[PDB]
């Protein structure tokens, strides 16, 4: 009755943690400047009509 972990699940794990930390660090960091009224930027982009606008 021996046990062993596959590899198809390993790759996912490693990436799961990596992405978690990556998005975390960046998220917590960008959460410092994002504190400002996000509506401000929304008004700019809307006028820029570069992404889903026009």
Domain segments of the chain: what residues?
Answer: 1-54
Q: Where are the beta strands (DSSP E) in 1-54?
A: none
Its CATH architecture, for the domain 1-54, is Helix non-globular (6.10)
Q: Are 51 and 45 in contact (CB under 8 A)?
A: yes
Q: Which two tokens stand for residue 45?
A: 């982009």
Asked how this structure was determined, the answer is NMR
Can you give the length of the chain in residues?
54
Expressed in percent and rounded to 5, the helix, strand and coil fractions of the chain are 65, 0, 35
Which residue bears the tokens 């809307």?
46
Contacting residues for 45 by C-beta, under 8 A, at least 6 apart:
51, 53
């Amino acid at each position: 009755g021996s046990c062993k972990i596959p590899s198809i699940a390993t790759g996912m794990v490693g990436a799961l943690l990596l992405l978690l930390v990556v998005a975390l660090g960046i998220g917590l960091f960008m959460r410092r400047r994002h504190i400002v009224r996000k509506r401000t930027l929304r008004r700019l982009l809307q006028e820029r009509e570069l992404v889903e606008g026009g």
